[PDB]
């Protein structure tokens, strides 16, 4: 019974593809900042909260499915929705939260702190805090710059150390004080550039699918990762101006180690790829995707890798990740990108556990 | 009961935002081609079929809601899904159709002819047939070229007369013989360019929202339709190459009269616009959206136009329709675009009633 010996908190990541409940036990240091954070419960359900009908019956069944069987209920809960909910009209988001708030008003133990759609900049902050907590890089001032990417279904986040810059929007910068050190981060989220939303722009692009894959328009895949990559790069740069926004900042504030969470782990774990030590390079990702996936016959691939979820998109996703990281962020194709092993299902939720403590009894900072 | 006096057929348009059942009565001419087509039943339900959970309980409820109270059931039924279903994995589409097939197997009167996701090119053919049927332009050879656009949530279609060309893909050309005339059409659908999917790439663009509209990233709208239009044009052309594909063909094959169905009629019916005769020009649409919507204060607009669905997107949609029609298709900003009055809810379903008869007892043409 860990919550009889430690503080405990529930954090729900309500993302575009599903909601994942975490309960963490933790202790605190001399400034009442969480340490010894341990996950004691993890439950995920599908589909995304923004994808279910926003009526009482459906939302009530979904929250019961997510929460009722948790081992401890008398604890603070944060329900934070991300890019899936950001895509909806305000009226629709309000209907979801009104029904969710009603559901919690009928719960006598759960302590609902907040339920809301967070900005992609908050999500990026929590991404960086969660990964650095796990890497054990927060307790002391670092030799090296650690950058984090989160590759979601609807948005993608990038976040890295950068000194305050009064020429850049206040919304894209965060200063915090944690474990005795002052940290200044650049944060950005690109809504629409998550894998699900991006893919809906390229489904009839033959270069983005394995040979003979049946495209929606009745034509056939004819995969070519470099060509698909160039198409996705036009969405990255001509549309979203990722290069113009990110490249000059990384040039001035280089990152020594890149970590990624989200969907790269799922792709890179395919047996179609040869990666070791839970790390890849963009050049190897694009080359392997081109040679083993894009240029292979669809029917053969399909039968040969039967456990590979969204295998039909692996030519597209190899090309898209390279477009995003290389052509968008300007990362060198030969630079190592660490991905957190998929078994961990690491998300940003530990960031909430840490962040909520940093202002103590100041309520409006 | 019309169907005791006439042939009858049910056609379901299962689009990205909902499904609309029509039952038509009709007679036939001396080639057994439908004439005197009349709508005797129309029922719409939300949301889109591709948006409900694909299990027997939910699918069964949805088809029951859509079909059970129809006045006549012992007739052929076509269930044709469009771009909403095109966006999904093949496995997921198979789940939906396996459950739908099972549901129809428990029905003793409905005669399910086909239930499938049709290509955007098929949808574009039906778009042209349905509109030209309503305009009464099919029975005799036209001295005028009539073009049709269908502005959907996930795809948009364009279709216009074009003599058969050996240099253009067979998939984008259709020859038919109807009412004794031979008609040759160019058809194209752009998946990802329907309004819902398009909008997901611009939700954090301040130029695309009314002043002080709260964007997902925490920043404020600062509307400017020409600027928003140039952003949306980069998705049309740099990404989808609409201009390169369409403009040369319209240059060689001018359209004399443009008609649109789908979302234009919803937008243009707002009291923010001044249009007459159910027609607009792109020049006027972009100017009016810029000055009445983009440059206005969000809270004022929101309270002033309380019945306007998706009012918060009208600066974006004005800018996007211009980007698509002018910068994409190359239509002159001063060219009249007819929109079918919104009360009609005219879709492409009459196109199915006509097209199914054209090959008579030939089953593999
Ligand atoms: O809600 Mo997301 O899947 O992290 O873009
Ligand atoms: O399924 Mo659509 O809404 O006609 O693009
Ligand atoms: Cl298509
Ligand atoms: Cl955001
Ligand atoms: Mg996420
Ligand atoms: Mg292996
Ligand atoms: Mg439609
Ligand atoms: Mg969607
Ligand atoms: Mg009026
Ligand atoms: Na999308």
UniProtKB/TrEMBL annotation, chains A, B:
Gene3D superfamilies for the chain: 3.30.420.40, Exopolyphosphatase. Domain 2
UniProt binding sites for AMP 1: 16-17, 20, 153, 310
GO annotation, cellular component aspect: membrane
One record GO biological process: nucleoside diphosphate catabolic process
Entry keywords, A to Z: Hydrolase, Metal-binding, Nucleotide-binding
Superkingdom field: Bacteria
Pfam families attached to this UniProt entry: GDA1_CD39
Residues reported to bind Mg(2+) 3: 234, 238
Annotated positions binding Mg(2+) 2: 104, 107, 110
Residues bound to Mg(2+) 4: 271
Residues engaged in binding AMP 2: 17, 44, 46, 266, 310, 314
Disulfide bond residue pairs: 3-8, 208-228, 294-315
Binding, Mg(2+) 1: 3
GO MF: metal ion binding; nucleoside diphosphate phosphatase activity; nucleotide binding
Binding site for AMP 3: 20, 44, 310
UniProt keyword annotation of Ubl conjugation present: no
PANTHER family for this protein: ADENOSINE/GUANOSINE DIPHOSPHATASE, GUANOSINE-DIPHOSPHATASE
Protein name: Ectonucleoside triphosphate diphosphohydrolase I
Organism: Legionella pneumophila subsp. pneumophila (strain Philadelphia 1 / ATCC 33152 / DSM 7513)
